[PDB]
Design a protein around this ligand. Structure first.
Ligand SMILES: Nc1ncnc2c1ncn2[C@@H]1O[C@H](COP(=O)(O)OP(=O)(O)O)[C@@H](O)[C@H]1O
Ligand SMILES: Nc1ncnc2c1ncn2[C@@H]1O[C@H](COP(=O)(O)OP(=O)(O)O)[C@@H](O)[C@H]1O
Ligand SMILES: Nc1ncnc2c1ncn2[C@@H]1O[C@H](COP(=O)(O)OP(=O)(O)O)[C@@H](O)[C@H]1O
Ligand SMILES: Nc1ncnc2c1ncn2[C@@H]1O[C@H](COP(=O)(O)OP(=O)(O)O)[C@@H](O)[C@H]1O
Ligand SMILES: [Mg+2]
Ligand SMILES: [Mg+2]
Ligand SMILES: [Mg+2]
Ligand SMILES: [Mg+2]
Lengths: 153, 144, 74, 538, 105, 93, 525
């Protein structure tokens, strides 16, 4: 689960559930006097064919969808969470932030460096008052009360 | 009775709740809610606790039946939006230039505390302190 | 019943060459009925499923090889 | 400044282990919460789709059943308010025999709604008065909801159909077979005289062949073995003795005084001759079966074997009395031969083996008799115990039918009709008691709600459909459990019927228990004592 | 079970599959390969032959009726009845309550 | 201890019972106040029977000063929290 | 202390500490028992160590079942126990008045007044109050309506509304049935039998006897229409010789003859019973019932059943007198000379079964001087509560019949006595006027507690009552439904005169003794 979180960031529960179910069914097969080597070979073949079928048939290209695809993906990911119902606004905020932190690299590959979005928490008003700062937010204050608290340019 | 030997007389919700040590995490959540309300606006600390308790009771009423909590949460959020709309609808403006209106507002705020015996003095003290602490530098307004 | 209906829909999609639009039939958890999730807007990255499948397969294979455990006392 | 002393007065005079609760919050709400918890514990066993519960008491004895009274009995309930609810349930079981789960569910709903009424601002007295008024109104309405009457109790098919509903809640899968068996057993008993005895039905549990192999026998079965050589009699002439089959002795003190050689030589011969004469005198009356309640001497057994007499020994005097009723004989206190009137007759007495148990069977070929026995087969002792509990429920239902022949529709139809009528009455009642009356009416919703929850469907639309249909005027429409979706059907044609007395007594007892719990304002519990039970209960 | 709407079909098929434990256990105890013997038995019974079962000595299947492997029908009748009753009793139970012991000594 | 732990996040104030440690009867009867110190796994303070030098109604400042007499105690308010791969940012490249 | 010097392991309270301890205990008892007073009082729940449930409202039952280990509480409990044993009512009022007396006395004692002055004032006020109580009592011919009113004023305060309504008729009818003109009432003649199979409102009165046992022989008749009742105290079972008799035989025939001849003593008395039964009745319609205090062995039971005789064994000792008074026979300790004139008659005897226990009903007697009260209820605690309530009601009706007078209730007499004491206060010479005022204030606790329990406020209700009484002069009490003044006599709220007199005497005596205690010791070890 930790590795799935690190490399993808989503589906950390589905991976655990699928792994446990695979292990349970494989143990049932072994108890049916099927050698574990055959079960492992079959599992490898099945995983390879599942990946191939997914990449061949079930994928949907997002080029013809647009920003609505990103909004829907964010809303789907935010379901089952404390901010699930407020997805209509949270997904817009997420998409705006990700598009804001967008940068390009060599070979013309648009790379989106998440963890550059500084997430600040502060209890108080409702979740609808969560702010998307068009800049950067620091968890720091001025060193002394003498200095002004607002600089224009 | 403070654990270090002090004595606390109060009817403030946050002052009472901060002195209670609990083991159930739900009580910890409620105490944190009380502290949030106290820090954000400084008033209505017992009201938020009472409202949360009542809403959770009426939610348990449906949880006893076969209604999933997600439906209850969706209804609660719709209700919260409608409450905000109605509260803004029934609100009235205040002319902050009027000292009498501000004093009356502070009075209605402190009618429920022990200082209500000396209401005019406390209201004048609070209003004068807030007025003279008001600052505006570099196009930024603050109270602090 | 819900999973049986979903499996029937997907089997009909894979068998009938003219029903390739039924591949998107998923689950509508609010109404408890199958629903075309592509139209409903229920999406997730392909990388999520691919990586989850690969990692789960590798973990199951790793555990499946163990048939003897020796636990030395500390 | 670091410790709260006990307040002067009653707090300081309290004993070391005692507890004192007073007021609404710490007494009434706690009692209501405990009763609600008990109702929740028992709720999932309600209705045909109820689930059996494995209960292990303090003696490792295992009970698996969905009978509410049994579950409460085998539960170490400690909260006194829940204890009152348990006593109400047990009283309902003793009075009627069915409806204990109804009592718990109704009492829990009543107490929960009473807690709500107290919270919103009502007083205890007003709630109690409203509940009493609503209970009176319900008892007035109930006779108007009677749909049909038994109208015959000597028939087999009709009695089986009547008891099918009673024994459908327990053993939902196979209730027709048990209905037929219990109907036959009850019809054999219950002669032309209107009185019917529940005790006259006997249940014998023999392991081995599954519950579908059970049967009813017109007689008695004893898990014993014959003490003589004779093991089968075709024209039994049973003579029953409460005294041991031996030469009786003086009650003061027996001392054989020997003064000459002749007496010593002749004593044993005389004793044996006397015993032989007594046994031959008994046999000369035609009695080919002798039953005794005491020990059997070796000489008596010898002389009974010599004259081809079957010996059956019964340890329990209750078994002896039941056998006397079954055969029609008189338990002679002496060893005198039985007169023509004291001699019992049975059509066949023989030794048989069922499974691995040796039994002695007193069989009547006629379709009558004072006592009938149901032999229960099965693959588990617990399963046969559950079947016996179902048989007890069916027999109690038949007894109630003999008492009162009126029936009301089941499946919550009667409860929904009562709720609707009581709500209509309460809407026209001015004053503060209207809230209590409406809450009492709403408490009836817990029966169809529990049925729908156990059947696996949503209770909300079930209850809404029930209200819609009953507003349309159909008073016999209740829950339909033979459906995967919330649906209702007329249940007068479906045959699901509840006894009028059962509903009447269940409502009365549940209301009384709820009111009695509500009346309590202060609780003073003494320090618990780890004694070996009070002497009275043994 | 292949001739019913489908909710009971899966459960009756599970019952039929569960009935296969006896030949499988025989093969496992004998050191056979249970899967191959079960497949051969299934194929044979499907195409005819009521009394084809596990042949322990020959590591194969054979007509057990002509091999004089006879048991009374009562044995299997009672076994099925008791096993079904036990399974139904276990499945029906949903909650287990264990009271504290008395006189633990 | 509660006050000092509140005002000293680095410290890891903890308490134990005398019965759970199974100490000698003399400890249980005449050495009730025992403030053991573990700095790197060794004592730098073994204060036992601190009642005489602290009294019976001492407060937090008294204990703090008494411990600081021998140099035992080492020398802002965020909103709630700030902490949230290692790829930070880049431009064009 | 000196005792502590002599006995180190002794605890002692001296000087004002003794008064403080005693008054605190009394005030605690009063605070607990305040809610009991009046029909609007709250039921209390009492759970014993074994887990038995006790629902009650009595002051005495509560005091017994409170977990208290205080000496002053023990003193008050003893006073209440004596009150209940003699008069059967007024325990809660006893505790309330004692507590209020101590509180009002301390109100002056704390200001440097010696308790002796307060006690002298208490004695003077008690004398004046007794005189006023004699003056104010209502002497009435005790008809059925007045007894019904008294039974209501007791049971309604003890149990729920219609349950009290039924118990009133039951108690009054039973008392009138057993009462003989110009003779003391023997309450032992009202058997209180309880069964646990019906509702609480099914409690009724049977003009006869109910016995908790039935015929032990299954062949005996379960219902006899016209029965000759035979009440006997003769053993009908085998009994051994007192002097170690023993038997000696030489052959089986001799043993048989000795066995047959050893039962002749009992068989002779059974034969006498059978001969009397044959002589007295020669038709199947008339029945014979034998009720024996001693045991009956199976042989005698069989012999009696063969003659159609219903026999009950091991009857209660008092049941002999009860059956003699109800049926009208003669209890016999021997059958040496028994005659048909010694047989009682009952118009119906039937046997009722209930679970594992059997009951025998003996009804339709000619003029039963001993009746029975059948308590029916679904719970054991309900039966206990009804038993306590009917005990209180029986005592109340008996006291009302004994003393031809009756006192208005609802606290009207307390208000009138308080006014009379205040008026008489100037006549008392010295500083005992403070004690008189304290006594009047203590007497005023009853209307205060009644108003408090009813839900109103004590001060305004009490001043309304006092103003009404002063203006009109009538004995106006407290209306528990509205709080307005109301005449207790005109509505039927009656109190026992003997109960009030005992209250005054006992409360004054115990308060005077407690106030004069200046030291509590425990040095017996
Ligand atoms: N609105 C929706 N309707 C139907 N299915 C959904 C919806 N939203 C999410 N899902 C599905 O629920 C599954 C569980 O996702 P979730 O558990 O929240 O992610 P994670 O596994 O990272 O915790 C996903 O596979 C997704 O396909
Ligand atoms: N004179 C008054 N009349 C009626 N209600 C009042 C009055 N003064 C204050 N309140 C109410 O009391 C509440 C304030 O209670 P308070 O003790 O401040 O608790 P909290 O701090 O949680 O608001 C407010 O909701 C207000 O409506
Ligand atoms: N076939 C059926 N369909 C719908 N409801 C039924 C059916 N059979 C019985 N019931 C309902 O089940 C209830 C009986 O529940 P049960 O488990 O017997 O509790 P209790 O033993 O306390 O009466 C009855 O009220 C009846 O209406
Ligand atoms: N209907 C009524 N209205 C007003 N007062 C009443 C009424 N009934 C009884 N009382 C008063 O309430 C008191 C009841 O006290 P009670 O509970 O019987 O205490 P105890 O049992 O110690 O006598 C009586 O003194 C009586 O004067
Ligand atoms: Mg997710
Ligand atoms: Mg406020
Ligand atoms: Mg039932
Ligand atoms: Mg009284």
């Amino acid at each position: 689960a930790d590795l799935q979180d690190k490399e993808v960031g989503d589906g950390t529960t589905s991976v655990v559930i699928i792994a446990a179910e695979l292990l349970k069914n494989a143990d049932e097969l072994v108890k049916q006097k099927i050698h574990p080597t055959s079960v492992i070979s079959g599992y490898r073949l099945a995983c390879k064919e599942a990946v191939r079928y997914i990449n061949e048939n079930l994928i949907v290209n997002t080029d013809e969808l647009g920003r609505d695809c990103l909004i829907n993906a964010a809303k789907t990911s935010m379901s089952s969470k404390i901010i699930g119902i407020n997805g209509d606004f949270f997904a817009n905020m997420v998409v705006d932030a990700v598009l804001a932190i967008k940068y390009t690299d060599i070979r013309g590959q648009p790379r989106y460096p998440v963890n550059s979005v500084n997430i600040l928490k502060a209890h108080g008003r409702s979740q609808m008052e969560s702010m998307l700062i068009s800049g950067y937010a620091l968890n720091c204050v001025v060193g002394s009360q003498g200095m002004p608290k607002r600089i224009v340019n | 009775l403070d654990p270090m030997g002090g004595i606390v007389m109060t009817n403030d919700g946050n002052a009472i709740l901060r002195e209670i040590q609990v083991q159930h995490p739900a009580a910890k959540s409620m105490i944190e809610i009380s502290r949030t309300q106290d820090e954000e606006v400084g008033d209505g600390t017992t009201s938020v606790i009472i409202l949360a308790g009542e809403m959770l009771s009426v939610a348990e009423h449906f949880l006893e039946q076969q209604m999933h909590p997600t439906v209850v949460i969706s209804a609660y959020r719709k209700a919260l939006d409608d409450m905000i709309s109605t509260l803004k609808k029934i609100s009235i403006p205040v002319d902050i230039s009027d000292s009498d209106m501000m004093l009356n507002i502070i009075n209605s705020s402190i009618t429920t505390k022990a200082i209500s015996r000396w209401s005019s003095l406390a209201c004048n003290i609070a209003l004068d302190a807030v007025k003279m602490v008001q600052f505006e530098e570099n196009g930024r307004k603050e109270i602090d | 019943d819900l999973v049986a209906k979903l499996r029937a829909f997907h089997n009909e999609a894979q068998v009938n060459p003219e029903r390739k639009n039924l591949k998107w039939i998923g689950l509508d958890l609010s109404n408890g009925k199958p629903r075309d999730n592509k139209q409903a807007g229920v999406f997730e990255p392909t990388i999520v499923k691919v990586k989850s499948l690969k990692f789960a397969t590798e973990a199951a294979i790793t555990i499946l090889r163990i048939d003897d455990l020796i636990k030395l006392h500390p | 400044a670091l410790h709260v002393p006990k307040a002067p007065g009653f707090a300081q005079m309290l004993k070391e282990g005692a507890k004192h609760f007073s007021g609404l919050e710490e007494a009434v709400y706690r009692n209501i919460q405990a009763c609600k918890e008990l109702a929740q514990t028992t709720r999932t066993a309600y209705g045909p789709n109820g689930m059996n519960k494995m209960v292990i008491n303090h003696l490792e004895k295992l009970f698996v059943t969905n009978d509410a009274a049994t579950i409460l009995r085998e539960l170490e309930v400690q909260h006194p308010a829940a204890k009152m609810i348990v006593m109400a349930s047990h009283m309902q079981e003793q009075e009627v025999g069915d409806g204990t789960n109804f009592v718990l569910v109704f009492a829990g709903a009543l107490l929960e709604l009473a807690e709500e009424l107290l919270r919103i601002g009502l007083s205890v007295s007003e709630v109690i008065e409203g509940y009493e008024i609503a209970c009176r109104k319900a008892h007035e309405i109930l006779p108007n909801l009677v749909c049909c009457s038994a109208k015959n109790l000597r028939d087999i098919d009709e009695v089986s159909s009547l008891l099918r509903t009673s024994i459908m809640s327990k053993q939902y899968g196979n209730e027709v077979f048990l209905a037929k068996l219990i109907a036959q057993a009850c019809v054999s008993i219950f002669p032309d005289s209107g009185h019917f005895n529940v005790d006259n039905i006997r249940v014998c549990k023999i392991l081995g062949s599954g519950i579908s192999s059970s049967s009813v026998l017109h007689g008695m079965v004893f898990k014993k073995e014959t003490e003589g050589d004779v093991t089968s009699v075709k024209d039994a002439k049973i003579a029953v003795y409460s005294c041991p089959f031996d030469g009786m002795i003086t009650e003061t003190k027996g001392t054989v005084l020997i003064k000459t050689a002749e007496e010593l030589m002749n004593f044993s011969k005389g004793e044996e001759n006397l015993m032989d004469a007594q046994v031959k005198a008994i046999a000369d009356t035609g009695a080919n079966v002798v039953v005794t309640g005491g020990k059997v001497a070796d000489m008596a057994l010898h002389y009974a074997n010599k004259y081809n007499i079957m010996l059956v020994r019964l340890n329990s005097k209750w078994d002896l009395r039941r056998l006397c009723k079954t055969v029609g004989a008189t338990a002679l206190p002496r060893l005198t031969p039985p007169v023509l009137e004291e001699m019992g007759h049975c059509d066949s007495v023989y030794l048989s083996e069922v499974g691995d148990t040796q039994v002695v069977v007193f069989k009547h070929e006629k379709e009558d008799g004072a006592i009938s026995t149901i032999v229960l087969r099965g693959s588990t002792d617990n399963l046969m115990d559950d079947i016996e509990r179902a048989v007890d429920d069916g027999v109690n239902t038949f007894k109630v039918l003999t008492r009162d022949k009126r029936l009301v529709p089941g499946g919550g139809a009667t409860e929904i009709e009562l709720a609707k009528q009581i709500t209509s009455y309460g809407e026209t009642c001015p004053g503060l008691e209207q809230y209590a009356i409406k809450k009492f009416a709403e408490a009836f919703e817990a029966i169809p709600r529990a049925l729908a929850e156990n059947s696996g469907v949503k209770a909300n639309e079930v209850i809404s459909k029930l209200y819609a249909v009953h507003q349309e005027g159909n008073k016999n429409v209740g829950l339909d459990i033979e459906a995967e979706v919330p649906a209702v059907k007329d249940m007068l044609e479906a045959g699901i019927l509840d006894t009028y007395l059962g509903k009447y007594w269940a409502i009365k007892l549940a209301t009384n228990a709820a009111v009695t719990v509500l009346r309590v304002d202060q609780i003073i519990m003494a320090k618990p004592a780890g004694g070996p039970k009070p002497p009275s209960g043994k | 079970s292949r001739t019913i709407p489908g909710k009971q079909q899966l459960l009756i098929g599970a019952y039929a599959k569960a009935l296969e434990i006896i030949p499988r256990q025989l093969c496992d105890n004998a050191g056979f390969d249970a899967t191959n013997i079960l497949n051969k038995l299934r194929a044979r019974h499907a195409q005819g032959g009521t009394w084809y079962g596990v042949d322990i000595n020959n590591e194969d299947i054979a007509d057990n009726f002509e091999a004089f492997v006879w048991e009374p029908a009562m044995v299997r009748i009672n076994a099925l009845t008791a096993a079904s009753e036990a399974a139904c009793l276990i499945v029906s139970v949903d909650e287990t309550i264990k009271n504290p012991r008395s006189t633990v000594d | 201890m509660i006050c000092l732990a509140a005002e000293y996040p680095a410290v890891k104030f903890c308490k134990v019972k005398s019965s759970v440690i199974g100490a000698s009867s003399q400890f249980t009867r005449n050495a009730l106040p025992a403030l053991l110190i573990y700095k790197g796994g060794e004592l730098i303070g073994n204060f036992v029977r601190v009642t005489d030098q602290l009294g019976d109604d001492f407060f937090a400042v008294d204990l703090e000063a008494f411990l600081q007499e021998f140099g035992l105690l080492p020398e802002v308010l965020t909103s709630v929290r700030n902490s949230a791969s290692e790829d930070s940012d880049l431009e064009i490249d | 202390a000196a005792v502590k010097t002599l006995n180190p392991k002794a605890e002692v309270a001296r000087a004002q500490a003794a008064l403080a301890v005693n008054i605190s205990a009394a005030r605690g008892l009063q605070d607990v028992l305040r809610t009991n007073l009046g029909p609007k009082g709250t039921m209390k729940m009492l759970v014993s160590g074994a887990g038995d449930i006790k629902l009650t409202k009595d002051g005495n039952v509560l005091l017994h079942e409170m977990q208290i280990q205080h000496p002053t509480a023990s003193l008050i409990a003893k006073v209440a126990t004596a009150q209940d044993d003699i008069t059967g009512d007024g325990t809660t009022s006893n505790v309330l008045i004692i507590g209020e007396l101590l509180k009002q006395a301390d109100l002056y004692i704390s200001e440097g007044l010696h308790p002796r002055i307060i006690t002298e004032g208490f004695e003077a006020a008690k004398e004046k109050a007794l005189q006023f109580l004699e003056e104010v009592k209502v002497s009435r011919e005790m008809d059925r309506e007045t007894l019904i009113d008294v039974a209501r004023t007791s049971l309604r305060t003890k149990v729920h509304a219609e349950l009290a309504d039924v118990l009133t008729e039951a108690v009054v009818d039973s008392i009138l049935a057993i009462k003989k003109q110009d003779e003391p009432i023997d309450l032992f003649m009202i058997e209180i039998m309880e069964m646990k199979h019906k509702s609480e409102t099914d409690t009724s009165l049977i003009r006869g006897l109910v016995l908790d046992h039935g015929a032990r022989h299954p062949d005996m008749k379960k219902r006899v229409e016209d029965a000759y009742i035979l009440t006997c105290n003769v053993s009908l079972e085998y009994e051994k010789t007192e002097v170690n008799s023993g038997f000696f035989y030489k052959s089986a025939e001799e043993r048989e003859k000795l066995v047959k001849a050893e039962r002749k003593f009992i068989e002779d008395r059974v034969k006498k019973i059978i001969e009397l039964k044959r002589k007295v009745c020669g038709d199947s319609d008339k029945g014979f019932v034998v009720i024996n205090q001693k045991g009956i062995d199976p042989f005698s039971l069989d012999a009696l059943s063969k003659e159609g005789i219903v026999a009950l064994r091991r009857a209660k000792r008092r049941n002999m007198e009860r059956l003699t008074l109800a049926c009208g026979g003669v209890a016999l300790n021997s059958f040496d000379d028994l005659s048909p004139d010694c047989l009682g008659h009952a118009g119906l005897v039937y046997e009722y079964t209930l679970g594992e226990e059997k009951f025998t009903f003996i009804e339709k007697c000619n003029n039963p001087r001993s009746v029975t009260l059948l308590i029916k209820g679904p719970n054991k605690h309900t039966l206990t509560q009804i038993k306590d309530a009917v005990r209180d009601g029986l005592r109340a009706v008996k006291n009302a019949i004994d003393d031809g007078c009756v006192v208005p209730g609802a606290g009207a007499v307390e208000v009138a006595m308080a006014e009379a004491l205040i008026k008489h206060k100037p006549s008392v010479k010295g500083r005992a006027q403070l004690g008189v005022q304290a006594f009047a204030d203590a007497l005023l606790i009853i209307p205060k507690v009644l108003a408090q329990n009813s839900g109103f406020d004590l001060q305004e209700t009490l001043v309304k009552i006092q103003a009404e009484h002063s203006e009109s002069g009538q004995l106006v009490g407290v209306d528990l439904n509205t709080g307005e003044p109301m005449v207790a006599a005109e509505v039927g709220v009656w109190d026992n005169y003997c109960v009030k007199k005992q209250l005054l005497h006992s409360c004054t005596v115990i308060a005077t003794n407690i106030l004069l205690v200046d030291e509590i010791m425990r040095a017996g070890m």
